[PDB]
Amino acid sequence: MKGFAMLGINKLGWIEKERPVAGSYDAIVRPLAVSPCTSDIHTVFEGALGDRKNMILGHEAVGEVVEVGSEVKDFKPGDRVIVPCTTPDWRSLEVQAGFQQHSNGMLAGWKFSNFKDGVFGEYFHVNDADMNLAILPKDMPLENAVMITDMMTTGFHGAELADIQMGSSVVVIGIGAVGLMGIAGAKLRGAGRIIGVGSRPICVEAAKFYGATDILNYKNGHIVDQVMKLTNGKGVDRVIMAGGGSETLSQAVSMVKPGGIISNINYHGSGDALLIPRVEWGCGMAHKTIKGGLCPGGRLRAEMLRDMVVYNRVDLSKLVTHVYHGFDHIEEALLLMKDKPKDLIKAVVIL
Amino acid sequence: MKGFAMLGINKLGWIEKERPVAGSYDAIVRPLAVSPCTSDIHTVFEGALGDRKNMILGHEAVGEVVEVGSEVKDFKPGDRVIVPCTTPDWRSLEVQAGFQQHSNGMLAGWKFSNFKDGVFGEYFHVNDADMNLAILPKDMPLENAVMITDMMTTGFHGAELADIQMGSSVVVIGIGAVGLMGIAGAKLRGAGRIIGVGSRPICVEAAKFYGATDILNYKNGHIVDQVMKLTNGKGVDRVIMAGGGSETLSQAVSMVKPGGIISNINYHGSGDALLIPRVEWGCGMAHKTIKGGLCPGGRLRAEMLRDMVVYNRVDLSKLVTHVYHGFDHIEEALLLMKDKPKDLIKAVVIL
Amino acid sequence: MKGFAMLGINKLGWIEKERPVAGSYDAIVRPLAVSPCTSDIHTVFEGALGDRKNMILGHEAVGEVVEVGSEVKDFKPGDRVIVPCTTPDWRSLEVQAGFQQHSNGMLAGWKFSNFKDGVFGEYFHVNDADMNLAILPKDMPLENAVMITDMMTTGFHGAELADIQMGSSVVVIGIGAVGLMGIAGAKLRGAGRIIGVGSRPICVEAAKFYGATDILNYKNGHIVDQVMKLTNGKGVDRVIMAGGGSETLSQAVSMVKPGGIISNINYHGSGDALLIPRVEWGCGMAHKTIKGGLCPGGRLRAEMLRDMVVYNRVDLSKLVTHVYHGFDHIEEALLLMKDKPKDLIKAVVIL
Amino acid sequence: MKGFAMLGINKLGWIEKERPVAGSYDAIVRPLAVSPCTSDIHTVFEGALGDRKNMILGHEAVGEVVEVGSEVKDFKPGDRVIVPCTTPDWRSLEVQAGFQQHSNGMLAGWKFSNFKDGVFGEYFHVNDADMNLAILPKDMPLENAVMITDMMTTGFHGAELADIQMGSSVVVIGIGAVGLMGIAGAKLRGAGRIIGVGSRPICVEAAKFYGATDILNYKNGHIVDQVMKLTNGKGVDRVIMAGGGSETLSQAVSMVKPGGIISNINYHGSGDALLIPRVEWGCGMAHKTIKGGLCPGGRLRAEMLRDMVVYNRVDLSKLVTHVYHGFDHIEEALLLMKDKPKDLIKAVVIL
Ligand SMILES: [Zn+2]
Ligand SMILES: [Zn+2]
Ligand SMILES: [Zn+2]
Ligand SMILES: [Zn+2]
């Protein structure tokens, strides 16, 4: 079958890969709409996963079940489904410990464009269909549905890990797609003041739309000083790290109140060392908790998020700035993701 | 001073009570706007607190600081403040244990119309001003501010105790003021589906406004069966008990999924026994947690909720259906609260 | 094969049932040592599960893997294993929600002597061997190992649900096997004062051994008054309901401090209504949380508990008062469980 | 009055400071037994708190109430009390937020040898006696009681922050007094395997006594590799950082399982940057939570810990290796703390 893959480091191209076969509990899905991700860029142009040879890219997609294994009972061919980027192996000790995203290994829940071929192919494999798929509502716009697969689940996970309280002040560093969802999630957790950090005009408007009460731009001051000024030297209760370099951790620690929580959902892949400012971290006694983790996946997660969209708890349309029709547009969309033009948040390719 | 008080059981009337004096850490506040509560009715007409003799009623009010003790540093006379219904004694072992609402006794945080004269007087006493008051924003409508004092804090507390997850299905039993805030709080915690239970037209519209995706009326089926039908026999993740008789507990347990949480914010005062249906509760092994508690009070709580109002996280105006001007209207407003006419949610008396 | 089963309500007897076959992920185990349980009695003599026809009893056993399905990779025939009483279907939405004990239904984790034949047979079926079995340490006494299967996991679960703090005062109502483990678990959670409620001499000594600092007997006062007297009217932080009638709930609520937690691990099966004393529960505003749930099962749980035994964190030997050798003794052991002689805690039948 | 103070950086000596006066809610206490701390050394010889001029040292002591303010109701002169090292200002927004250790500032709960003169004086000041003191049991050995003030509360706090589960594997880095308490606390939280890291013979024996199942020495391998080998490449669930340089953070992250928790109770004061190994931290997506915080103080904390000692939940005697009689011995004891002889854990000076 045809599939857009990473030929080699810094080399992209369409290839003729084999068609995946479904195991007894698996499903073969044909993509209806997909979306390129920053991670795809990191994998190819930054060798985040080493020299992957001819591995199909993509992990964000909604599609149609084409084939189903003999044991799949809840999903059958023809079923339109939302595919969470994280598809864990539900039968593992990690799952029993309550950490699905790490079933059988650290970050093992993330299989697409890692352990196996991604969604940028005529067909892709989904392990344990009954446990990793969710039905796509008949009237849900494809572009929006694709946003659930990673953007929504990740951003919301940032807000969840942040353990936000009713009225908590929150700072979201990085207002890209994930950051915007972090803002949306923060608001949906009862956050009061939400300060989004970014400069891209399109992202700024989206940030405000999702709940940002204040917008800070690096271009006019050290972010911590700006936050401090806005909070009258008090600082903020929570900080969600969604974008930026490793230095953001230091900034997060510096702007969060002692006893606050810093939630990281930014997949760092460049500087090999995130640093905690000793003095600002109260020498490790300021009670400034630091959390960070891969977005939850699986059927339940997808269904719960889906239901939130169905009940209009969040409008994912604002994340989609570019929509292409026709499989061939994947390359252009991915390159767009690499070049990062000023008016881009997310791009969806509807087949 | 003049004050509307409970003369005796089932007897209401204005009296000439003494003017409260402020201790070193206390403040004497003059009400700007007050609101009658269902609890006031329960106290007077249902002897919920026994035969209280000439005790001034009310615990929902925003006012102006008239007098301040020598040790009060953050509040001075002239200051317009939001007074939380719960004003705990912050120096107690219960506070150290993390339960302010019970500082120095069960429900000891609730002093107005219980341990001391309420807010339905020319002046009222606030213990530990610096720890129990919050500045009322210059442009915040009085009617709305009063809703923060109890309705908002209680309803939101129900959603908080419910430990709602992103996408959780929630059933709110009782769509009166508190229930409406429970719905609003639920939505602000990321709830997906929110089923409100009630029939009063005005409350139903308010419920939908605050986030209710479905509305159920007792008049056409056993609530549990209706919930079951709506959820395809799956049940709901959370249940917030905001209104109704003791039987609602049984209904809550029956409709919540095993492992779910039932949050009670309904002050029961009639049937002296809430029953848990053994079979439905999985014989006490279904992991159906039951929580219940007085609304948090104090300065921080009031400020956090206030900030949420300032940041338009919730529109409290929909709770206020009746607004009177002039202290004398307290009686009429309280009686209105007793008669419960079809178009009443909350009534605010602006002095 | 031969198996001791419930012929009908109040009728016990050995029968010739068919031998269970192992599915691809299942295992057929031959019991090495088993233990009768109070639940077995409730099922037979109290029809707790209705009129079960010829269903083999028992759910507490350690054995040897005889047969293994083609997909079982971690367990092979000859392996000596600890079988948790709770063997969940790890591939379910409830598991994804974090509630294994209810995978595919309320209390669905408990299959033995419920959904299928128990362990009181020449062989018994274990679903998903790799996910529901644990290796029995070579030198671990069989009698002790059997205590892990239910007694330890349940009692400890009570302490876990109780969310005990370092120094918390805990009252354990019912000092039978489960209660004794509740006491042991409470101590292992850092509880300070532990008050055990019971009178049976043998259980009293065991209670003290496991950590009980005080022992209360109903025979000389209303338990709440006794607890109050001991705590100087202050009450206790936590209460674990391990035994007694439905009235214990009321007692638990009455003796626990507002903001405390009541953990129920007592499978109620008689009075069809547990009552919460309104006034003592602070009318549902005292922050007295009530939890209750089936013991966790599965491999991880069994392994973790096992490791605690291996590291001498708890001595399970004190639970075993009667040890029989020979399969035929199951009847006598079960009857002993029904008659409840003064010197009985738990009885183990080593085949 | 006489008091052992920090004359200047690296300069220790007895001085004639003024006697503290008690405010309305305060108490003046005379030390009965005190204990030098590593922090005292860091303050003096490492300028951890800058150039403190003539500030009396010490924050670990049990004493007798000499003077009591007019508002102190629970404590009167003659009362023997345990003084927690952390004495928060219970009337603050931080307390309302649930973080007493930071009342009115980061680490503001720690007043002795920071915001005011320490306990190494003829008399010392205790703010809010009723909220910050605990009665010393008549028969509790002074040396042991002093260990409660900081060592016990800190070590246990490490175990508490670690959110240990029944059977969790825990690694405690640094087996000094705090680390030993971390081990004891870990065991008291139901930890299964406890690996203590250290080499000092006296500390090693104490570690085993408190619950350490394994002891690792840096002298024979990279600690992570050793831990990995012991756990069969699986790693550990929790890691408590009690001692060592900033590099221990990296080691903790490297040895903890993804989804595990790292609890820091080591007051870092040397290298001004604790580093998180990007790759080992799963690039900030491994769910490896990092917590760290000052020991809880106040009356409730002290009483709960005290009760644990009373109920023999922990034997603090093993922490005390040196006991001196006579106030003058403070200097020798503090110097001993600086020189760190092989046979020293903690030293207590009984006046
Ligand atoms: Zn993605
Ligand atoms: Zn009210
Ligand atoms: Zn059993
Ligand atoms: Zn110290």
mmCIF file of C-alpha atoms and ligand atoms in Angstrom, chain D residues 37 39 59-60 150-151, ligand 4:
data_model
loop_
_atom_site.group_PDB
_atom_site.id
_atom_site.type_symbol
_atom_site.label_atom_id
_atom_site.label_comp_id
_atom_site.label_asym_id
_atom_site.label_seq_id
_atom_site.Cartn_x
_atom_site.Cartn_y
_atom_site.Cartn_z
ATOM 1 C CA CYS D 37 21.182 20.063 62.960
ATOM 2 C CA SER D 39 21.021 23.108 58.714
ATOM 3 C CA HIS D 59 15.387 24.533 65.900
ATOM 4 C CA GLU D 60 15.094 21.103 67.521
ATOM 5 C CA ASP D 150 12.436 17.665 62.870
ATOM 6 C CA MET D 151 13.909 14.268 62.031
HETATM 7 ZN ZN ZN E 4 16.714 20.274 61.941
#
